[PDB]
């Protein structure tokens, strides 16, 4: 299975691009994704992916990545989403952790 | 007729004048008159300016820091003014620009009277106080209070001088933070709430510092046996943490206290380790080992 | 051999107690220290240690820890120090990484700034 053991950040600005350190159970650097998602009553989810190269996977037990941009960069209230590890080869996922996207401060 | 009733009716006698373009206007910092009055502790003036802003539904105007006048009063530790503001409907469930709720600010600073003010004001304004709100660090207000108290305790067991302006300040903050924690719990805060980063409970957080006063406080709660063996994301319990610590003068007693109040020494983490497997090498770890095995 | 691969914070408040994620080459959880240090003019050395328990060492390849308090919490300008891994058993050290201690920002809520303001 997959498991997120610790994350140094569980909130981020909707603009994305912010660096996060994630500690995990053993993964393989070319078979791992970090999936952000948000399930509305809808039929097809919103999703975004953590930005990192395989070299950012540290000794199979940690990943340093940048947050994806949230779907709406113009929100005025924080949006609660989820983050999970996903394996590319068999699409298995870790249990989801809550992640908070907060509004951008667009002045100066 | 109490004095406050006099100065209030007296206040409105002096500023039934201002009016409506001058106190709704914002400073370069975004501060209205109420923000400043609140910060200065002008209870009578704050009451009047608030009532006039409230009628226009402009009570919760935020400055450049994302702080309403109510949020400013919280930070300023003006619990009298706080209660006045929340009573007439000031939004309790809000954040500043750093993502902190008024409860979080109370928790960090140990403003228990402010916290009690919020509780009363919310009752008299039909507001729901979200005790489990998380800040941008994934922490509930209880979490913040515990971490703040750990820092105080850790320093008290380190600075070598009573007469210092800081230590007497630390001593009072030691008391105020515990009072704040008690208030939060009395208000219904979940001790078993987990930090979003690591899955630590308030008990876990206390155990990290071998914080005897808080460990004792939490373990006395009715739900003690329901969270004493709670596991963080890495599978560790508070007993795992206590047994493994860098040497503190209160480490042994923390382990004893956890054992005595029902912590399970056979619990295993993600790597199948029990607390006994985590003890430091040498005599100290041997002493901890006996406590974990002994009755 | 010891190595700090990367750290999620390269600066922190002089007050200490701030959580840092450090990624390292392989260490043993009971045999590792994180040492903040600063050479001083009289030839002495200030040192402070990261605060963590062995369980905060993640699978021998990462350490989550709290910063030490800097030697002087009253500085008005940031102070640069070095941070290194150190093995307790043989006192081998990693190459150092830069770390900046900055002054505590009192009254970030700007409470006192408002008290100084004037009104009609
Ligand atoms: C501000 C003093 C800098 C200290 C410096 O980082 C270490 O002593 C390097 O030897």
């Amino acid at each position: 299975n997959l498991k997120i053991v610790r994350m140094d950040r569980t909130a981020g600005c909707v603009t994305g691009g912010e660096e996060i350190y994630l500690l995990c159970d053993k993964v393989q650097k070319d078979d791992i994704q970090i999936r952000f998602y948000e399930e509305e009553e809808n039929g097809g989810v919103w999703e975004g992916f953590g930005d990192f190269s395989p070299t950012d996977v540290h000794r199979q037990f940690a990943i340093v990545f940048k947050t994806p941009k949230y779907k709406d960069v113009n929100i005025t209230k924080p949006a609660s989403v989820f983050v999970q590890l996903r394996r590319k080869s068999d699409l298995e996922t870790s249990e989801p952790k809550p992640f908070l996207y907060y509004p951008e401060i667009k002045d100066k | 007729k109490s004095l406050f009733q006099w100065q209030v009716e007296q206040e409105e006698s002096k500023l039934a004048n201002i009016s409506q373009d001058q106190f709704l206007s914002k400073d370069a910092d975004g501060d209205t008159f109420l923000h400043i009055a609140v910060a200065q502790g002008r209870r009578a003036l704050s009451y009047v300016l608030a009532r006039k802003m409230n009628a226009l539904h402009m009570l919760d105007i935020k400055e450049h820091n994302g702080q309403s006048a109510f949020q400013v009063a919280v930070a300023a530790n003006q619990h009298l003014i706080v209660q006045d503001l929340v009573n007439i409907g000031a939004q309790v469930n809000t954040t500043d620009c750093w993502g902190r709720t008024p409860l979080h600010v109370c928790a960090e600073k140990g403003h228990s009277q402010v916290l009690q003010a919020i509780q009363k004001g919310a009752v008299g304004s039909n507001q729901f106080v979200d005790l489990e709100a998380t800040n941008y660090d994934g922490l509930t207000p209880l979490h913040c209070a515990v971490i703040a108290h750990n820092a105080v305790v850790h320093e008290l067991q380190r600075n070598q001088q009573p007469h210092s302006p800081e230590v007497q300040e630390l001593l009072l903050k030691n008391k105020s933070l515990v009072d704040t924690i008690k208030c939060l719990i009395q208000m219904g805060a979940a001790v078993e709430a987990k930090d979003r980063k690591s899955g630590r409970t308030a008990l876990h957080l206390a155990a990290e510092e071998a914080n005897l006063e808080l460990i004792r406080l939490f373990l006395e709660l009715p739900s003690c046996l329901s969270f004493v063996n709670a596991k963080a994301y890495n599978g560790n319990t508070a007993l795992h943490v206590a047994a493994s610590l860098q040497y503190r003068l209160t480490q042994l007693d923390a382990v004893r206290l956890l054992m005595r109040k029902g912590a399970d020494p056979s619990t295993r983490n993600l790597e199948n380790e029990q607390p006994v497997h985590l003890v430091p090498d040498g005599p100290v770890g041997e002493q901890i080992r006996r406590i974990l095995k002994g009755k």
Side-chain angles (χ1 to χ4, degrees), chain A residues 2-106, chain B residues 3-295:
Chain A
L2 300 166
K3 183 183 289 287
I4 300 175
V5 179
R6 221 177 172 151
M7 296 177 65
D8 70 346
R9 296 174 49 172
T10 57
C13 187
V14 290
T15 51
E18 295 178 326
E19 187 165 87
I20 297 186
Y21 283 45
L22 178 150
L23 310 185
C24 56
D25 272 336
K26 204 168 196 177
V27 301
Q28 196 279 334
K29 65 179 167 61
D30 304 293
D31 203 20
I32 196 63
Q33 285 182 328
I34 296 170
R35 179 174 178 257
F36 291 71
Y37 68 97
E38 189 187 20
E39 293 175 340
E40 289 188 2
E41 183 66 16
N42 141 65
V45 80
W46 168 83
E47 64 178 17
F49 293 87
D51 176 31
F52 66 97
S53 74
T55 57
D56 292 316
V57 177
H58 172 66
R59 289 288 183 258
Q60 305 194 242
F61 281 112
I63 307 173
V64 179
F65 68 99
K66 295 189 176 60
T67 56
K69 181 183 303 299
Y70 179 58
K71 60 177 178 57
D72 187 20
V73 299
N74 293 310
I75 66 175
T76 53
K77 321 225 120 57
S80 293
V81 303
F82 292 94
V83 63
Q84 65 184 180
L85 297 164
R86 186 169 75 183
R87 184 183 297 120
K88 295 179 184 179
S89 57
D90 68 353
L91 294 178
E92 182 165 348
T93 53
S94 72
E95 297 294 326
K97 305 290 184 185
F99 188 89
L100 187 73
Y101 272 115
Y102 49 79
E104 177 189 1
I105 322 290
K106 334 147 303 300
Chain B
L3 172 56
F4 180 61
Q5 249 175 105
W6 179 81
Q7 236 279 15
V8 163
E9 78 170 54
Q10 218 42 238
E11 266 299 335
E12 264 151 39
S13 160
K14 317 119 181 175
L15 63 331
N17 154 13
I18 183 70
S19 275
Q20 183 267 5
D21 283 338
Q22 296 86 355
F23 68 78
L24 279 192
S25 152
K26 299 175 63 60
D27 180 28
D29 291 338
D31 291 334
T32 71
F33 291 163
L34 183 51
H35 290 82
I36 308 179
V38 149
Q40 289 169 352
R42 287 214 248 294
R43 186 188 171 187
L45 183 48
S46 296
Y47 182 87
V48 176
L49 293 174
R51 189 187 64 85
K52 269 151 182 91
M53 290 171 69
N54 189 22
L56 280 63
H57 308 95
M58 301 289 286
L59 181 62
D60 290 329
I61 287 179
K62 291 176 174 290
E63 68 187 60
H64 77 88
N65 287 314
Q67 296 174 319
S68 72
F70 154 60
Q71 289 169 277
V72 174
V74 174
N77 198 16
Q78 302 286 351
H79 57 94
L80 290 178
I81 296 180
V82 165
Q83 189 169 356
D84 293 337
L85 293 169
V86 186
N87 189 28
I88 69 179
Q91 177 65 280
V92 282
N93 297 321
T94 184
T95 64
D96 51 25
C97 63
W98 303 283
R100 324 139 81 204
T101 69
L103 299 192
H104 286 103
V105 180
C106 286
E108 292 181 6
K109 297 185 180 301
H111 293 171
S112 56
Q113 298 180 19
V114 174
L115 189 53
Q116 294 176 282
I118 299 179
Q119 177 183 18
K120 296 174 182 175
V123 169
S125 59
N126 197 30
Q127 293 195 65
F128 166 78
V129 193
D130 187 12
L131 293 163
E132 305 309 317
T134 63
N135 62 12
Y136 287 174
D137 295 323
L139 300 174
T140 66
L142 181 55
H143 294 141
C144 293
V146 172
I147 295 173
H149 190 241
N150 288 348
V152 167
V153 168
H154 187 73
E155 199 57 28
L156 278 179
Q157 293 172 312
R158 289 194 18 209
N159 179 326
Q160 330 322 325
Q161 171 146 359
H163 276 58
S164 316
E166 27 197 299
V167 158
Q168 161 244 311
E169 149 183 341
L170 283 174
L171 281 177
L172 276 170
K173 214 172 180 178
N174 170 86
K175 171 73 188 313
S176 68
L177 281 168
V178 175
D179 290 343
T180 300
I181 289 172
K182 288 179 183 171
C183 291
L184 285 171
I185 293 177
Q186 190 271 341
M187 290 166 67
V191 182
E192 72 283 3
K194 302 154 80 73
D195 159 38
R196 288 185 162 190
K197 293 183 178 189
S198 65
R200 287 171 293 182
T201 74
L203 187 61
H204 279 107
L205 295 178
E208 287 186 354
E209 195 54 44
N211 193 330
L212 296 187
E213 181 165 12
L214 289 192
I215 292 171
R216 189 176 295 102
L217 186 67
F218 294 150
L219 292 182
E220 285 297 306
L221 296 166
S223 60
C224 169
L225 291 183
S226 294
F227 63 81
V228 62
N229 296 313
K231 290 178 176 180
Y233 296 159
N234 59 15
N236 288 308
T237 67
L239 186 56
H240 281 97
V241 174
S244 68
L245 292 178
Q246 294 164 332
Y247 182 84
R248 286 167 167 78
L249 289 161
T250 56
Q251 183 180 14
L252 261 51
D253 281 340
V255 177
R256 293 188 182 102
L257 182 50
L258 287 161
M259 289 297 295
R260 181 165 64 89
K261 304 301 288 200
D264 187 348
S266 70
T267 305
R268 297 185 183 269
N269 61 19
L270 287 188
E271 296 188 271
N272 285 315
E273 296 164 323
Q274 295 170 334
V276 63
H277 297 131
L278 302 175
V279 299
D281 207 32
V284 175
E286 294 177 350
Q287 304 176 37
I288 301 175
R289 181 167 216 123
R290 302 168 207 135
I291 301 173
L292 291 167
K293 295 183 180 301
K295 327 146 208 52

